[PDB]
């Protein structure tokens, strides 16, 4: 069972990515629980400087039990390290590896009738680069870092001069981690594009390719343009830190705002890279359980292409308060409102797909419907934020945090769960228990809404991002948000129990297609699991 990691088959690589993404996901979710423990009440109770005088293990366990304020010297560095860790793990080492590396590798070749990826050995390498990057990200947490402590307290986007002046080498390890992630993603994208263009089945014209395979294809192009740009941005940070350059240091004639343009030029594409495969999954799931073909197949493809292209010309709406001129702010505002149209429209197409159908409310369909609701709630607050005059107030507040957790974080997560319940029988030969799938859905759906909806109120009341502690007036909604996070975490632990149950003693799958005739793509014509060598 170590011939798992040396496998070159797309299905085995898909499975490794999914399991690895889930495990890193658990670590990063655990960070958010600790984060929400500290945010549950005003005053610092958990992240005490006193815990540093113990061991790494002894310090760990002491930090999980609350202290009186009088016994807790606030340690802002720990807060900053945790949230940076949370953001970096999620954005580089969790959701893209699960969606693109996992479901992408497993299902795209199956959907287009390809026997495997163009470069199977390169696919295996992409996985190991992901793992090495993850290891470096995690190592950075325990490496000499800022303020004479361990880890980098610099935010997931690494703004200089803060990132360039952080002491120790924790930050250099983090930069190396991101280089390795980017390399993994680029190798993946090269494979996906070559396979999609060269290795389709005879008869499989481009207008006959399933939407999920299209979503992976568009995503792959975004990676090839965006990730090299990120690689430049962070190498420039690495040279400012270690090799005497002054790209972002005013004393040498640099401009920190330059880094922001380069970072966000990657950074916007990044969020569409995250959500595009979830779009693919939602389309397949809704068509299956509505028993009805996808409404407007070609508009769906074209919307994804348009979003992919326009996603490269909106980056500076992440910079409205950074010192952009009135003209720049106005342009990026216009461009942002434009990309909103084909994005928000997809919600109407998914509703139209349901309309007039014969709806079965099985677990995967529940995740997909939850997705529609959450993506709408997140999308509309994006609309608010696009207006630069109003972003003046909301920027760097919890209102932004609420926006992206709804639209992106939960969007990607609901897509992941939709895929897992949809496909676990096909991948494993074992079926999940239906009542547990539904219980998971409802705990998660209630918990996620309790977590993030009150953050809108926090933002409107002016609560800033990246704060270990907050004025007493923010107490009520922080408390509610934290209870929601604890409920969500309970749902995720239940989920892991469900997966364990399913894989060890779940009902044997006997059918090639255990759903219905309207799951009409090629994986449903294969066995469950499919043969080692398909097509």
């Amino acid at each position: 069972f170590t011939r798992w990691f040396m496998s070159t088959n797309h299905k085995d690589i898909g499975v490794l990515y999914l399991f690895t993404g889930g495990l890193v996901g658990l670590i990063s979710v655990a960070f958010t629980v600790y984060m929400r423990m500290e945010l549950m009440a005003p005053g610092v109770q958990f992240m005490c400087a006193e815990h540093l005088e113990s061991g790494l293990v002894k310090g760990f366990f002491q930090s999980l039990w609350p202290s009186a304020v009088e016994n807790c010297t606030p340690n802002g560095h720990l807060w900053n390290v945790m949230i940076t860790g949370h953001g970096i793990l999620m954005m580089f080492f969790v959701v893209i590896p699960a969606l693109f590396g996992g479901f992408g590798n497993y299902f795209m070749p199956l959907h287009i009738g390809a026997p495997d990826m163009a470069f199977p050995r390169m696919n295996n390498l992409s996985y190991w680069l992901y793992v090495a990057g993850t290891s470096l990200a995690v190592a950075s947490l325990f490496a000499p870092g800022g303020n004479g402590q361990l880890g980098s307290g610099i935010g997931w986007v690494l703004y200089p001069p803060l990132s360039t002046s952080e002491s120790g080498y924790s930050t250099d390890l983090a930069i190396f981690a991101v280089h390795l992630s980017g390399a993994s993603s680029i190798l993946g994208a090269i494979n996906m594009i070559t396979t999609f263009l060269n290795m389709r089945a005879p008869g499989m014209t481009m207008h006959k390719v399933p939407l999920f395979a299209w979503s992976i294809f568009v995503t792959a192009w975004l990676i090839l343009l965006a990730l090299p740009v990120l690689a430049g941005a962070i190498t420039m940070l690495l040279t400012d830190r270690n090799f005497g350059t002054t790209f972002f240091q005013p004393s040498g004639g640099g401009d920190p705002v330059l880094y922001q343009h380069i970072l966000w030029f990657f950074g916007h594409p990044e969020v569409y890279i995250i959500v595009l495969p979830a779009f693919g999954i939602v389309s397949h799931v809704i068509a299956t359980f509505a028993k009805k073909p996808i409404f407007g197949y070609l508009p769906m493809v074209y919307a994804m292409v348009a979003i992919g292209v326009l996603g490269f010309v909106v980056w500076a709406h992440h910079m409205y308060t950074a010192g952009l001129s009135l003209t720049q702010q106005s342009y990026f505002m216009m461009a942002t409102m434009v990309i909103a149209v084909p994005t928000g429209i997809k919600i109407f197409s998914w509703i139209a797909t349901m309309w007039g159908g014969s709806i079965e409310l099985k677990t995967p369909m529940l995740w997909a419907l939850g997705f529609l609701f959450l993506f709408t709630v997140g999308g509309v607050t994006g609309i608010v934020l696009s207006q630069a005059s109003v972003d003046r107030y909301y920027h760097d507040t919890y209102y932004v945090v609420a926006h992206f957790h709804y639209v992106m974080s939960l969007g990607a997560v609901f897509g992941i769960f939709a895929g897992i319940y949809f496909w676990i029988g096909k991948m494993s030969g074992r079926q999940y228990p239906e009542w547990a799938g539904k219980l998971h859905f409802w705990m998660m759906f209630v918990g996620a809404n309790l977590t993030f909806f009150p953050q809108h109120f926090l933002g409107r009341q002016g609560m800033p991002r990246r704060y270990i502690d907050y004025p007493e007036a923010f107490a009520t909604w922080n408390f509610v948000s934290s209870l929601g996070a604890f409920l969500s975490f309970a749902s995720f632990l239940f989920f892991l129990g469900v997966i364990f149950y399913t894989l060890t003693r779940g009902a044997r799958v006997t059918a090639n297609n255990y759903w219905n005739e309207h799951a009409d793509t090629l994986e449903w014509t294969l066995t469950s699991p499919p043969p080692e060598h398909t097509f």
């Binding site: 920190p256 950074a322 107030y393």
Partner: protein
């Protein structure tokens, strides 16, 4: 002075407006809010209706349509109309916000790790502003009896902890204040929610914002760009006073 620019317990709305710019933000947001609440309720009711009406027990044979040109035209144009309308109200407000008028009062603000420095170039006044309870005032960024005592002595209460600073930026009511913002070491961000202003304090750059306060009182902001260990601990206090009280404060700083 009345404490006006602050969060309130269990609050769900904006902080009170004390400038014409803040007022425009409240109105524009309220306008967009109506629209987005409509969109959200609409989409939610559609999903819920569709699931009730077309459940497999109620609709046993599914339809097969994948097109509806009139509907697809309607649902494309309507979003476009909504956004053009928002932009029509929104762009003038942005222009008002970002076009820097002639200053009655000029303050240059510099962000440091972890405090703000204020300079009044016309008045040759400069000073630094630390959180009450920061190491500068003898604390370590937490509440304590000593910290509560200092808050009280400065004209505040225990409830203003994390917001109140040892010195305030003082300005006259109904006057155009132009603030020039830069950073000394890393990027910080200077803001006052009640004024509807925020501007990153970037090392090597000087950026400008303006406000005109429409009532007297005390208004707080908090550093809005992560800048290291005490990011959570370097707030902003602005006191808006009468022209005469402002003059009196100016004279208190004059060295003979």
């Amino acid at each position: 002075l009345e404490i006006i620019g602050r969060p309130q317990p269990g609050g769900t709305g904006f902080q009170p407006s004390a400038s014409p710019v803040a007022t425009q933000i409240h109105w524009l947001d309220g306008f967009i809010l109506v629209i987005i609440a409509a969109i959200t309720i609409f989409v939610t009711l559609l999903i819920l209706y569709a699931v009730w009406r077309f459940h497999e027990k109620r609709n046993k044979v599914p339809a097969r349509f994948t097109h509806n040109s009139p509907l697809e035209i309607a649902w494309t144009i309507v979003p476009i109309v909504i956004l053009v309308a928002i932009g029509a109200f929104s762009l003038p407000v942005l222009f008002n916000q970002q076009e820097i008028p002639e200053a009655d009062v000029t303050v240059k603000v510099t962000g440091y790790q972890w405090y703000w420095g204020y300079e009044y170039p016309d008045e040759e006044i400069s000073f630094e502003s630390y959180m009450i309870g920061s190491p500068a005032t003898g604390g370590d960024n937490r509440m304590s009896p000593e910290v509560e005592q200092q808050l009280i002595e400065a004209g505040y209460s225990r409830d203003e902890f994390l917001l109140a600073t040892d010195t305030a930026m003082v300005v006259p009511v109904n006057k155009t204040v132009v603030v020039q913002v830069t950073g000394a070491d890393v990027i910080h961000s200077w803001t006052v929610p009640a004024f509807g202003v925020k501007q990153d304090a970037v090392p090597g750059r000087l950026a400008q914002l303006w406000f005109r306060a429409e009532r007297e009182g005390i208004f707080f902001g908090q550093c809005s760009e992560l800048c290291g260990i005490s990011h959570a601990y370097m707030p902003i206090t602005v006191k808006v006073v009468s022209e005469e009280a402002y003059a009196a404060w100016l004279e208190q700083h004059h060295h003979h």
